[PDB]
């Protein structure tokens, strides 16, 4: 929440959004990568996962 709600939310709701530099997009793609892998792994086992992967509870 500290990233999307604080930074990217006020921009994309103004009808004339303009991101400053590409260095922000690449940073945001890394943060939004762990959350994608969690739902991808939950979408085939129908809820119960074994063994717990590194994306879920890292070392």
């Amino acid at each position, epitope marked *: 929440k500290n990233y999307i709600d*604080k*930074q*990217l939310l*006020p921009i994309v709701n*103004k009808q*004339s959004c*303009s*991101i400053s530099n590409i260095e922000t997009v690449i940073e945001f793609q890394q943060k939004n990568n762990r959350l994608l892998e969690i739902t991808r792994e939950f979408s085939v086992n129908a809820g119960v996962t074994t063994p717990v992967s590194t994306y879920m509870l890292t070392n």
Partner: antibody
Amino acid sequence: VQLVQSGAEVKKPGATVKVSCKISGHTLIKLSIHWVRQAPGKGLEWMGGYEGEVDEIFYAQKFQHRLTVIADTATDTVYMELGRLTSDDTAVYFCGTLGVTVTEAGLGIDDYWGQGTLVTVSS
Amino acid sequence: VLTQSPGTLSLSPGERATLSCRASQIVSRNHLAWYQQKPGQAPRLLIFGASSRATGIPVRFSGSGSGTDFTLTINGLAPEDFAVYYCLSSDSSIFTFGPGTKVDF
């Protein structure tokens, strides 16, 4: 998505006028509205406005203590009042929604501007 | 206190046009926009942030500048963009327009 102005009218010096703004398409809890005056053939000048994001009102230094702007959030309307009206304020008034919301990633702005109406200070 | 130049210009259509905006005191690179308006109608917003185009304008328009100098240049000058070009600014939160330049011919 489009702003609508009040009706144009004639006026006499010494009185106080009222200008209204109706919003249809948004909630005004986020829109920032202002007021610009364009003279008949001259440039514009920012007079005052209400932001909504911070719920604050700013008035121009040259117009301070002469006007009061009240915006009803629930009734989605911002009211433009002008006290001590002289004979040289015969100009077209546009509302306009101009403002930059700078964050750590970029910039944000918009523009609707309504349609504007003219007020004439006759004898 | 913003001053525009070269006042009035009357260059032929189809040639690039240069407009300048100077600031008496230093302003941010952001908090600056260019408005072109034909008389009697609602002004449109050309660029915001002094280097970023708006939503729904041709690729021809482009603006740059930093410090107390800001320049707007248009490469293709169609007969549908002859108007007065204002240069809005805001130091902290106060908006102050400019005298305005008019593109003729």
